[PDB]
Short mmCIF file of N, CA and C in Angstrom, two decimals:
data_model
loop_
_atom_site.label_atom_id
_atom_site.label_comp_id
_atom_site.label_asym_id
_atom_site.label_seq_id
_atom_site.Cartn_x
_atom_site.Cartn_y
_atom_site.Cartn_z
N UNK A 1 28.48 -22.87 24.44
CA UNK A 1 28.28 -21.83 24.86
C UNK A 1 26.59 -21.92 24.45
N UNK A 2 25.82 -22.85 24.14
CA UNK A 2 24.70 -23.19 23.94
C UNK A 2 23.21 -22.72 24.46
N UNK A 3 22.69 -22.34 24.34
CA UNK A 3 21.16 -21.13 25.30
C UNK A 3 19.80 -22.03 24.90
N UNK A 4 19.31 -22.12 25.33
CA UNK A 4 17.58 -22.61 25.09
C UNK A 4 17.39 -21.70 24.09
N UNK A 5 17.37 -22.80 23.01
CA UNK A 5 16.84 -22.57 21.24
C UNK A 5 15.83 -22.77 21.71
N UNK A 6 14.63 -21.85 20.60
CA UNK A 6 13.07 -21.52 20.97
C UNK A 6 13.78 -22.58 19.06
N UNK A 7 12.58 -23.27 18.75
CA UNK A 7 12.05 -23.88 18.04
C UNK A 7 10.92 -24.35 17.31
N UNK A 8 10.51 -24.79 15.58
CA UNK A 8 9.28 -25.14 15.51
C UNK A 8 9.17 -26.26 16.32
N UNK A 9 7.36 -25.93 16.60
CA UNK A 9 6.30 -27.68 17.22
C UNK A 9 5.26 -27.48 16.60
N UNK A 10 4.55 -28.20 16.83
CA UNK A 10 3.02 -28.75 16.99
C UNK A 10 2.47 -29.36 17.93
N UNK A 11 1.30 -29.65 17.92
CA UNK A 11 0.05 -30.91 18.69
C UNK A 11 0.65 -31.75 18.25
N UNK A 12 1.66 -32.78 19.53
CA UNK A 12 1.65 -33.85 19.16
C UNK A 12 0.76 -34.67 19.51
N UNK A 13 0.83 -35.81 18.25
CA UNK A 13 -0.58 -36.70 18.43
C UNK A 13 -0.06 -38.37 19.21
N UNK A 14 -1.08 -38.83 19.07
CA UNK A 14 -0.66 -39.87 20.06
C UNK A 14 0.65 -40.82 19.18
N UNK A 15 0.28 -40.96 17.60
CA UNK A 15 1.39 -41.49 16.99
C UNK A 15 0.99 -40.76 15.41
N UNK A 16 1.47 -41.49 14.46
CA UNK A 16 1.68 -41.47 13.34
C UNK A 16 1.84 -42.58 12.85
N UNK A 17 2.08 -43.08 10.94
CA UNK A 17 2.44 -44.10 9.71
C UNK A 17 3.23 -43.84 9.14
N UNK A 18 4.20 -44.60 8.91
CA UNK A 18 5.08 -44.33 7.79
C UNK A 18 4.45 -45.83 6.37
N UNK A 19 2.98 -46.54 6.90
CA UNK A 19 2.58 -47.13 5.70
C UNK A 19 1.07 -46.29 5.46
N UNK A 20 0.74 -46.76 4.38
CA UNK A 20 -0.37 -46.21 4.02
C UNK A 20 -1.49 -46.87 4.35
N UNK A 21 -2.36 -45.97 5.08
CA UNK A 21 -3.72 -46.96 5.22
C UNK A 21 -4.91 -46.88 4.44
N UNK A 22 -4.79 -48.40 5.09
CA UNK A 22 -6.39 -48.80 3.75
C UNK A 22 -7.37 -47.88 4.26
N UNK A 23 -7.73 -48.13 2.66
CA UNK A 23 -8.64 -46.74 2.84
C UNK A 23 -10.52 -47.61 3.06
N UNK A 24 -10.47 -49.02 2.63
CA UNK A 24 -10.97 -49.78 3.39
C UNK A 24 -11.25 -50.03 4.83
N UNK A 25 -10.47 -49.71 5.33
CA UNK A 25 -10.51 -49.97 7.47
C UNK A 25 -10.19 -48.50 7.93
N UNK A 26 -10.71 -47.49 7.13
CA UNK A 26 -11.07 -46.52 7.94
C UNK A 26 -12.43 -46.97 8.31
N UNK A 27 -12.80 -46.28 9.81
CA UNK A 27 -13.89 -46.10 9.75
C UNK A 27 -14.70 -44.89 10.47
N UNK A 28 -13.77 -43.55 10.58
CA UNK A 28 -13.80 -41.85 10.94
C UNK A 28 -13.05 -41.54 10.58
N UNK A 29 -13.37 -40.15 10.23
CA UNK A 29 -12.87 -39.13 10.10
C UNK A 29 -12.49 -37.97 11.01
N UNK A 30 -11.62 -37.85 11.59
CA UNK A 30 -11.90 -36.90 13.13
C UNK A 30 -11.10 -35.44 12.78
N UNK A 31 -11.23 -34.57 12.82
CA UNK A 31 -10.52 -33.84 12.48
C UNK A 31 -9.76 -32.61 13.44
N UNK A 32 -8.36 -32.46 13.80
CA UNK A 32 -7.72 -30.95 14.63
C UNK A 32 -8.06 -29.69 13.61
N UNK A 33 -8.71 -28.61 14.04
CA UNK A 33 -8.10 -27.40 13.52
C UNK A 33 -6.90 -26.58 13.87
N UNK A 34 -6.61 -25.31 13.42
CA UNK A 34 -5.67 -24.70 13.84
C UNK A 34 -6.37 -24.05 15.39
N UNK A 35 -5.32 -24.04 16.33
CA UNK A 35 -5.02 -23.13 17.45
C UNK A 35 -5.81 -24.35 18.54
N UNK A 36 -5.12 -25.31 18.00
CA UNK A 36 -5.46 -26.86 18.98
C UNK A 36 -4.09 -26.95 19.95
N UNK A 37 -2.76 -26.29 19.15
CA UNK A 37 -1.73 -26.76 19.07
C UNK A 37 -0.97 -26.45 17.95
N UNK A 38 -1.66 -27.07 16.82
CA UNK A 38 -1.86 -27.25 15.36
C UNK A 38 -1.86 -26.13 15.15
N UNK A 39 -0.22 -25.59 14.56
CA UNK A 39 -0.38 -24.82 13.08
C UNK A 39 -0.71 -24.80 12.05
N UNK A 40 -1.52 -26.57 11.56
CA UNK A 40 -1.97 -26.86 10.25
C UNK A 40 -3.23 -27.70 11.10
N UNK A 41 -3.69 -27.91 9.37
CA UNK A 41 -5.31 -28.59 10.81
C UNK A 41 -5.02 -29.97 9.72
N UNK A 42 -4.93 -30.86 11.00
CA UNK A 42 -4.61 -31.98 10.61
C UNK A 42 -5.56 -32.93 10.55
N UNK A 43 -5.82 -34.32 10.20
CA UNK A 43 -6.59 -35.35 10.24
C UNK A 43 -6.45 -36.55 11.00
N UNK A 44 -6.83 -36.48 11.99
CA UNK A 44 -7.18 -37.64 13.06
C UNK A 44 -7.91 -38.67 12.79
N UNK A 45 -7.31 -40.18 12.04
CA UNK A 45 -7.78 -41.11 10.91
C UNK A 45 -8.56 -42.44 12.92
N UNK A 46 -9.20 -42.75 12.92
CA UNK A 46 -9.69 -44.26 13.72
C UNK A 46 -10.04 -45.17 12.37
N UNK A 47 -9.71 -46.32 12.61
CA UNK A 47 -9.74 -47.30 11.76
C UNK A 47 -10.56 -48.32 12.57
N UNK A 48 -11.28 -49.22 11.78
CA UNK A 48 -11.81 -50.32 12.40
C UNK A 48 -11.06 -51.66 13.48
N UNK A 49 -10.27 -50.85 13.55
CA UNK A 49 -9.07 -51.73 14.19
C UNK A 49 -8.58 -50.63 16.05
N UNK A 50 -9.55 -49.67 15.46
CA UNK A 50 -9.73 -48.70 16.59
C UNK A 50 -8.31 -47.81 17.21
N UNK A 51 -7.23 -47.87 16.11
CA UNK A 51 -5.71 -47.49 16.22
C UNK A 51 -6.07 -46.24 15.69
N UNK A 52 -5.67 -45.53 16.58
CA UNK A 52 -5.77 -43.64 16.77
C UNK A 52 -4.44 -42.90 16.38
N UNK A 53 -4.52 -42.48 15.00
CA UNK A 53 -3.63 -41.44 14.56
C UNK A 53 -3.91 -40.65 14.12
N UNK A 54 -2.92 -39.58 13.67
CA UNK A 54 -2.81 -38.10 13.12
C UNK A 54 -2.43 -38.37 11.86
N UNK A 55 -2.31 -38.15 10.50
CA UNK A 55 -1.88 -37.89 9.19
C UNK A 55 -2.26 -36.48 8.72
N UNK A 56 -1.29 -36.79 7.59
CA UNK A 56 -0.65 -35.31 6.64
C UNK A 56 -2.20 -35.17 5.85
N UNK A 57 -2.80 -33.62 5.87
CA UNK A 57 -4.35 -33.84 5.64
C UNK A 57 -4.20 -33.86 3.83
N UNK A 58 -2.84 -33.05 3.33
CA UNK A 58 -2.56 -33.44 1.88
C UNK A 58 -1.87 -34.87 1.58
N UNK A 59 -1.99 -35.34 2.14
CA UNK A 59 -1.57 -37.29 1.89
C UNK A 59 -2.26 -37.37 0.48
N UNK A 60 -0.72 -38.01 -0.54
CA UNK A 60 -1.67 -38.13 -1.68
C UNK A 60 -2.87 -39.22 -2.01
N UNK A 61 -2.88 -39.99 -0.65
CA UNK A 61 -4.32 -41.33 -0.57
C UNK A 61 -5.18 -41.03 -0.27
N UNK A 62 -4.97 -39.70 0.81
CA UNK A 62 -6.40 -39.32 2.19
C UNK A 62 -7.11 -38.15 1.17
N UNK A 63 -6.69 -38.14 0.26
CA UNK A 63 -6.91 -36.97 -0.92
C UNK A 63 -8.36 -38.07 -1.69
N UNK A 64 -8.67 -38.96 -1.41
CA UNK A 64 -9.71 -39.89 -1.86
C UNK A 64 -10.87 -40.10 -0.98
N UNK A 65 -10.29 -40.00 0.26
CA UNK A 65 -11.36 -40.06 1.49
C UNK A 65 -11.82 -38.51 1.81
N UNK A 66 -11.01 -37.85 1.28
CA UNK A 66 -11.55 -36.18 1.44
C UNK A 66 -12.70 -35.81 0.47
N UNK A 67 -12.34 -36.33 -0.68
CA UNK A 67 -14.03 -36.74 -1.57
C UNK A 67 -14.34 -37.82 -1.18
N UNK A 68 -14.42 -39.09 -0.35
CA UNK A 68 -15.29 -39.46 0.02
C UNK A 68 -16.14 -39.13 0.77
N UNK A 69 -16.25 -38.30 1.77
CA UNK A 69 -16.88 -38.01 2.53
C UNK A 69 -17.80 -36.58 1.95
N UNK A 70 -17.70 -35.74 1.12
CA UNK A 70 -18.10 -35.06 0.32
C UNK A 70 -19.49 -35.85 -0.75
N UNK A 71 -20.16 -35.10 -1.64
CA UNK A 71 -20.71 -36.03 -2.82
C UNK A 71 -19.83 -35.55 -4.00
N UNK A 72 -19.98 -36.32 -5.07
CA UNK A 72 -19.00 -36.48 -6.31
C UNK A 72 -20.09 -36.41 -7.47
N UNK A 73 -21.31 -36.51 -7.51
CA UNK A 73 -22.53 -36.49 -8.35
C UNK A 73 -23.63 -37.63 -7.65
N UNK A 74 -24.72 -37.27 -9.00
CA UNK A 74 -25.64 -38.83 -8.47
C UNK A 74 -26.49 -38.96 -9.76
N UNK A 75 -27.06 -40.18 -9.92
CA UNK A 75 -27.62 -40.37 -11.30
C UNK A 75 -28.60 -41.87 -10.72
N UNK A 76 -29.95 -41.89 -12.11
CA UNK A 76 -30.29 -42.99 -11.37
C UNK A 76 -30.76 -43.39 -12.62
N UNK A 77 -31.45 -44.83 -13.10
CA UNK A 77 -32.15 -44.85 -13.93
C UNK A 77 -33.81 -45.43 -13.83
N UNK A 78 -34.89 -44.16 -14.41
CA UNK A 78 -36.25 -44.94 -13.82
C UNK A 78 -36.53 -45.52 -15.56
N UNK A 79 -37.18 -46.71 -15.72
CA UNK A 79 -37.62 -47.76 -16.03
C UNK A 79 -38.62 -48.54 -16.05
N UNK A 80 -39.37 -48.53 -16.59
CA UNK A 80 -40.70 -49.84 -16.58
C UNK A 80 -40.39 -50.98 -17.29
N UNK A 81 -39.57 -52.46 -17.00
CA UNK A 81 -39.83 -53.74 -17.91
C UNK A 81 -40.63 -53.64 -19.13
N UNK A 82 -39.66 -53.41 -19.88
CA UNK A 82 -40.11 -53.74 -21.77
C UNK A 82 -40.33 -55.27 -21.59
N UNK A 83 -41.08 -55.80 -20.83
CA UNK A 83 -41.35 -57.14 -21.40
C UNK A 83 -42.76 -57.17 -23.05
N UNK A 84 -41.60 -57.62 -23.99
CA UNK A 84 -42.39 -57.69 -24.77
C UNK A 84 -43.01 -59.04 -25.37
N UNK A 85 -44.02 -59.66 -24.81
CA UNK A 85 -44.67 -61.16 -24.59
C UNK A 85 -44.93 -60.87 -26.06
N UNK A 86 -44.85 -61.74 -26.39
CA UNK A 86 -45.09 -62.27 -28.07
C UNK A 86 -44.71 -64.27 -28.67
N UNK A 87 -45.66 -64.44 -28.47
CA UNK A 87 -45.30 -65.82 -28.90
C UNK A 87 -45.87 -66.37 -30.30
N UNK A 88 -47.02 -65.33 -31.07
CA UNK A 88 -47.22 -64.99 -32.40
C UNK A 88 -48.12 -63.83 -32.07
#
């Protein structure tokens, strides 16, 4: 005599992946914040193939993509070409 059981649920995406998405084949990073039916902030990937997927934000490979959007550092070498013209 089972009745209508409430269960944990989230915002249903277009689709998800079982394969690690190519860091090179990423086009843009779209964000789904909490309140959108999502208990968790989830990252929607748009690929170069125009494949629309929602992957876990704390996926171990995606960490580099989240590090790619922010600055790491900056360095530059300003130097004049030391052209030591010397026949004698």
